Amino acid sequence: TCNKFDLKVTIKPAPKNTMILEICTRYRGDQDATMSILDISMMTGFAPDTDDLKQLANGVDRYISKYELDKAFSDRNTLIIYLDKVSHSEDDCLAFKVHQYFNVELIQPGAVKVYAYYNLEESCTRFYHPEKEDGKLNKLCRDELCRCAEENCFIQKDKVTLEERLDKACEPGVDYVYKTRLVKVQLSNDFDEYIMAIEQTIKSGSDEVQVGQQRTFISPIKCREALKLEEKKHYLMWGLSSDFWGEKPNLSYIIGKDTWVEHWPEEDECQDEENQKQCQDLGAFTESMVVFGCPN
Amino acid sequence: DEDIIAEENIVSRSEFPESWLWNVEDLKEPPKNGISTKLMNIFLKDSITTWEILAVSMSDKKGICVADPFEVTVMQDFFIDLRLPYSVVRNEQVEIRAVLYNYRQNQELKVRVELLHNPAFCSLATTKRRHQQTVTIPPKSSLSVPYVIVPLKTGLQEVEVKAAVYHHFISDGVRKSLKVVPE
Amino acid sequence: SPMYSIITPNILRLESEETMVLEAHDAQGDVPVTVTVHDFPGKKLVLSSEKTVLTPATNHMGNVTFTIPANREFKSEKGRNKFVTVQATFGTQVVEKVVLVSLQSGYLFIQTDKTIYTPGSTVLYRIFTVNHKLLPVGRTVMVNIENPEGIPVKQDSLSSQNQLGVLPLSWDIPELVNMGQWKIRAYYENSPQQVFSTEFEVKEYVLPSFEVIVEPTEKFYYIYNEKGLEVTITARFLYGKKVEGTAFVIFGIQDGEQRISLPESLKRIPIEDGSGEVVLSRKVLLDGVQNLRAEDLVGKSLYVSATVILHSGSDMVQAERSGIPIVTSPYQIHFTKTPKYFKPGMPFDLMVFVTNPDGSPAYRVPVAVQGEDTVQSLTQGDGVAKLSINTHPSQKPLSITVRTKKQELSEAEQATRTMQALPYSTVGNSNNYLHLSVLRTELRPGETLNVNFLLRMDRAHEAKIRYYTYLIMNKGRLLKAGRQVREPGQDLVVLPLSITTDFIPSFRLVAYYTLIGASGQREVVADSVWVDVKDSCVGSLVVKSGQSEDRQPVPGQQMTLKIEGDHGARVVLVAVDKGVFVLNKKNKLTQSKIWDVVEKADIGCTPGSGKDYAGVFSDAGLTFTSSSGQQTAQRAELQCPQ
Amino acid sequence: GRPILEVPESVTGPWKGDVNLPCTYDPLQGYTQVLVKWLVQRGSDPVTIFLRDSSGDHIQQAKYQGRLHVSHKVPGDVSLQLSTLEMDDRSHYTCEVTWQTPDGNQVVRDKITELRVQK
Numbered sequence A: 001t002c003n004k005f006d007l008k009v010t011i012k013p014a015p016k017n018t019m020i021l022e023i024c025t026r027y028r029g030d031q032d033a034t035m036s037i038l039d040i041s042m043m044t045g046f047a048p049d050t051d052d053l054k055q056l057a058n059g060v061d062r063y064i065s066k067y068e069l070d071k072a073f074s075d076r077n078t079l080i081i082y083l084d085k086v087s088h089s090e091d092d093c094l095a096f097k098v099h100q101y102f103n104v105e106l107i108q109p110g111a112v113k114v115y116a117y118y119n120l121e122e123s124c125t126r127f128y129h130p131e132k133e134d135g136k137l138n139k140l141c142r143d144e145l146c147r148c149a150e151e152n153c154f155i156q157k158d159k160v161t162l163e164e165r166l167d168k169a170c171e172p173g174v175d176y177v178y179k180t181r182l183v184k185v186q187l188s189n190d191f192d193e194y195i196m197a198i199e200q201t202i203k204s205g206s207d208e209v210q211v212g213q214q215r216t217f218i219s220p221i222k223c224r225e226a227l228k229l230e231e232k233k234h235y236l237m238w239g240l241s242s243d244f245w246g247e248k249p250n251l252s253y254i255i256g257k258d259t260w261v262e263h264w265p266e267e268d269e270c271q272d273e274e275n276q277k278q279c280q281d282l283g284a285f286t287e288s289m290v291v292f293g294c295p296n
Numbered sequence B: 001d002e003d004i005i006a007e008e009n010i011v012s013r014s015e016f017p018e019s020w021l022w023n024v025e026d027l028k029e030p031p032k033n034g035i036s037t038k039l040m041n042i043f044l045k046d047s048i049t050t051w052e053i054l055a056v057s058m059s060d061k062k063g064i065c066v067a068d069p070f071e072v073t074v075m076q077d078f079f080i081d082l083r084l085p086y087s088v089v090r091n092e093q094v095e096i097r098a099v100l101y102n103y104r105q106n107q108e109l110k111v112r113v114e115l116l117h118n119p120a121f122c123s124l125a126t127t128k129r130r131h132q133q134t135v136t137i138p139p140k141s142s143l144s145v146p147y148v149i150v151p152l153k154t155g156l157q158e159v160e161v162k163a164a165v166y167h168h169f170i171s172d173g174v175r176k177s178l179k180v181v182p183e
Numbered sequence C: 001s002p003m004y005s006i007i008t009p010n011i012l013r014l015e016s017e018e019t020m021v022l023e024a025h026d027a028q029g030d031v032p033v034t035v036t037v038h039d040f041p042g043k044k045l046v047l048s049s050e051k052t053v054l055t056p057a058t059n060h061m062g063n064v065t066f067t068i069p070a071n072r073e074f075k076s077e078k079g080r081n082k083f084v085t086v087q088a089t090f091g092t093q094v095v096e097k098v099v100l101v102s103l104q105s106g107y108l109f110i111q112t113d114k115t116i117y118t119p120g121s122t123v124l125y126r127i128f129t130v131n132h133k134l135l136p137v138g139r140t141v142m143v144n145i146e147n148p149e150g151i152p153v154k155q156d157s158l159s160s161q162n163q164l165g166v167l168p169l170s171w172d173i174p175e176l177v178n179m180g181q182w183k184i185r186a187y188y189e190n191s192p193q194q195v196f197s198t199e200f201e202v203k204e205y206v207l208p209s210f211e212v213i214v215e216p217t218e219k220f221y222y223i224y225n226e227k228g229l230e231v232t233i234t235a236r237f238l239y240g241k242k243v244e245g246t247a248f249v250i251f252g253i254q255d256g257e258q259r260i261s262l263p264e265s266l267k268r269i270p271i272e273d274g275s276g277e278v279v280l281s282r283k284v285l286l287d288g289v290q291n292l293r294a295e296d297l298v299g300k301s302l303y304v305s306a307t308v309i310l311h312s313g314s315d316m317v318q319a320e321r322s323g324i325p326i327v328t329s330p331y332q333i334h335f336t337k338t339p340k341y342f343k344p345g346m347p348f349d350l351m352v353f354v355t356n357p358d359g360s361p362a363y364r365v366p367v368a369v370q371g372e373d374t375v376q377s378l379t380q381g382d383g384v385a386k387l388s389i390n391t392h393p394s395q396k397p398l399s400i401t402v403r404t405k406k407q408e409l410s411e412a413e414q415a416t417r418t419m420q421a422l423p424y425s426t427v428g429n430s431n432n433y434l435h436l437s438v439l440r441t442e443l444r445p446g447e448t449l450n451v452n453f454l455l456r457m458d459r460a461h462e463a464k465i466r467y468y469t470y471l472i473m474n475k476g477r478l479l480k481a482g483r484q485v486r487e488p489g490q491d492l493v494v495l496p497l498s499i500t501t502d503f504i505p506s507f508r509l510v511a512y513y514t515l516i517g518a519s520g521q522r523e524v525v526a527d528s529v530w531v532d533v534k535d536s537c538v539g540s541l542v543v544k545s546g547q548s549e550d551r552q553p554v555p556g557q558q559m560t561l562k563i564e565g566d567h568g569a570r571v572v573l574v575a576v577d578k579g580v581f582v583l584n585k586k587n588k589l590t591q592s593k594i595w596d597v598v599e600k601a602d603i604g605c606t607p608g609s610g611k612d613y614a615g616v617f618s619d620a621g622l623t624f625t626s627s628s629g630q631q632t633a634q635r636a637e638l639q640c641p642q
Numbered sequence D: 001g002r003p004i005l006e007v008p009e010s011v012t013g014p015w016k017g018d019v020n021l022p023c024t025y026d027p028l029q030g031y032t033q034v035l036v037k038w039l040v041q042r043g044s045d046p047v048t049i050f051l052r053d054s055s056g057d058h059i060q061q062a063k064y065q066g067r068l069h070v071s072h073k074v075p076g077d078v079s080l081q082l083s084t085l086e087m088d089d090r091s092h093y094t095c096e097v098t099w100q101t102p103d104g105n106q107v108v109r110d111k112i113t114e115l116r117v118q119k
């Protein structure tokens, strides 16, 4: 809880890739706080407008140091705006242009922190980001504990030759291999839900699941469109032991960077000059696993 | 990359006691002008700071004597200062700065900094993709590098960051603990 | 008819050696002496040991050196004060004295490796067990860890026996724990009523990367200074480099414990090249108070608070300087080192102590008596100047006023203090006196010191004064006693006394002569002087970069420390990161703390002289007793009057 | 008599610049110099910053490393030179010399100067 400060921070696109950062702060116990500090860090590969800063600094009530001003666009990822005061009658709001100068993937949330000079503990910190809002990193929590969802949606992508499948499913902790019909797709905001019914166990393991039984699969919301699954349809699924969720007999599975999810064409739909190869190979994959069993 | 020390070959400074050399000797070696001399060999810890060494002596004939403080400064041209807080709450997001310093008198340095990955922390660092920036630090100057993390496990957990400079055999690592607290 | 006399200390220590000083005056041939110690009321004899012989070969001045041991009888009348009867038999004649005893076995000193700790960390501490000469002793000690609300939570009982007076002990601070000022509390088993403590703080923190020093340009504030109060902020990295950043400084007035902040004083300055200045305006200060009269602020103090944030924002730190006194003068004058008794008709020496308002000595500062023109002397490094006035032979109490006469200052800026002195009363109005003097110089061991014995008595009896008896008290025990010879006609004579390390941190010279004057009147005349040796260790100790000299070492690199000190001595070490001291720097163990404890334990209460002879001896910490019935009055109080 | 130290009551120096605190004595027979010591009065009371002996020169407080030098040419000259004065250097400095007499005993003389720093 932000005991002594309300902090509201937004990032919005400009009316290579510049943006508008808006900082809205005010303080609790309605006589204005004295000298206060706004400590701002940038999104990886962003820098403020030298002008907008000089603009902010020159209007009295606020101070931005010469040392911060003489800094280069080359390396200015932190920044401190000093405020002569901040009450709560309203919100004291400011905004400046942040320019991207280094196009790298992912990009890390920025952060804003407020406090008065004479007490650092009593502070408020909000994180900002374009594709996440409120800046929170993709985690996946139930009850008490989280998992880092910031990672690949599932073993990624074109040729998928028989070796490539037969090989990749005998690595470290490949604990299960199922053919699955998808029985219900319980969407939601925070985390998705895919009830897969196990059509057969190709490789069993750390979970004695019987054929006909259903198992829930969780996946982050930001993966929804990339997985793009639909009910009634069959699948192929790798997965590890470190991917489970909750105690026996109620063991939920998680889809992460290490899981293989593959669309399996239906029985009659196999006979098509576009699904010819995949159907044969997925069929070949099964028998090699059943009759032989990873010749490790 | 080219002309930079590999991440695996960088050994991270880790021993950061607030206090040490809590330690006893007797001046046994025979006197020379009433004065005995001991030579103590020590290993200095990893902190980049100034140790204030203090000695008290107790003597049958001469009693109790408190030496004057003698300071030792431990120092490097290039190094990281990982600035962690004392505790962090579980599943709450925090920023932590990893400041980089440069004291070469007339030379800037290309540096590749990096946050390491840990199962106990959620951050852009994952087991198969590194989380490295590449910054330029002007001479007689420092740079903050902000890393955002989310603490998952409880108890005493470890944040660690490394840095290597381009075109020089210079580099540093730091491994500090912080405390993870339940809800 | 011979007078047998005996001098011992006002209070006597248990289990330690003490000296009792035998004399027969106007005696003939060998006069053998037994000396016995019993407990007081209801007797059982604790030291019958020690007899001696008084010979003309030594002009009948001997000593017996005894030790009273601890007994069950000394610990079965607790809460009230212990006592003994000290009994000398000079052949056949007996002289006795009841003498206070103390169980105070010596001192204890507690050392903690840090000044501030966090929950989950261990406290490392040592206890130094010494006696009243600061030598190591093996005794049983009781040790308590005490939490911020006053509760024992760990107890311990150790013996520093075979341990070179060092007791290493530790305590693990639990994870769930009361933040605040914890306490360590040690005392000797035998003397539970004397407790030695140390604080340490338990807090949640991380070490800062830099340090902040906030210093006023003058060590005080003068109310007539138009410029206000100049303060310098110095910020510096703990590895030695300078700091760039921003500082918020803010001032406040303190009156006793009432802290009244001055919000209108708050500034925000840049710290460039590790430095920055800031002034508290005199207008702001006077307008921050409601009493507003500028002289109503004299005696209060000013404090400054600085927060410094680096331009990185990645770390900040706070620092405060306190107790900047508001003064009308840059000086104070003290008469704590001047005896408060004069000898009518003789000179009166004055040891004026001049301090700066924070209490430190003011080197090379002139002082003079009010009414005296010309008559001035400069103060020494220890901030004491000597002056002397001639006193008129009446019993009229002396009222002395001393001023600073420092050029550069106005006259309202000069310091002043007044003191009164009473006349030493002689036996039957005989006007017989003795005056000891010493030269004004900072005295170190190794030096020779000339003690002047000046006589003053009628010519009709002076020819009988063949010798002066003198004694040297140091650290509450008798250190040395001898005779200073004198031949008839001599008024002044000098004892050339050699100052050894045994004289630290200071000492008393008491001296006396005796005769049969006027009638069958037995007369004692005494005087004493308090002399201040320069403080330092008795031996020495130095840690230095043993690896000969220079360079700045790298993290984890090997290096050689060179410890140098007294042969045989046990040396204990600690290395503390200077960051700790940025958070907390209170109660660190210091050699000048040790002496300051030692001088606070003094059984002498007066810088010299007295109302009479029996006053002279007792004020100095001594008992005098004789077969003619001349004696010091009973001392029953274990502590100096106040 | 024993040797005698000469040290100015005060010295003044340019901020950011250099300064010299003179400490000189006329040598005497039977008085070997065996130790030089400079202390700084850290407000309360004093703390050894420099140290010269048979072994060599010794800086015993880190804020002086690099900035501190004590004359060593003319016998009798043990003056102290600080470089790059910081406001924090403002303080009392004590020069203390220790001689040995042929029999063995040591004798000590010291003197205090007040260093000032002018902006």
Ligand SMILES: *[C@@H]1O[C@H](CO)[C@@H](O[C@@H]2O[C@H](CO)[C@@H](O)[C@H](O)[C@H]2NC(C)=O)[C@H](O)[C@H]1NC(C)=O
Binding pocket: C019, C062, C063, C064, C065, C478, C479, C480, C481, C482
């Ligand atoms: C009590 O008795 C003797 C006098 O003989 C003193 O002890 C000796 O003192 C002389 C110097 O005056 C030394 O040469 C000896 O080494 C000492 N011997 C002993 C037995 O310790 C002693 O100082 C006298 N007590 C006092 C305080 O005067």
Ligand SMILES: [Ca+2]
Binding pocket: C505, C506, C532, C533, C534, C535
């Ligand atoms: Ca002293």
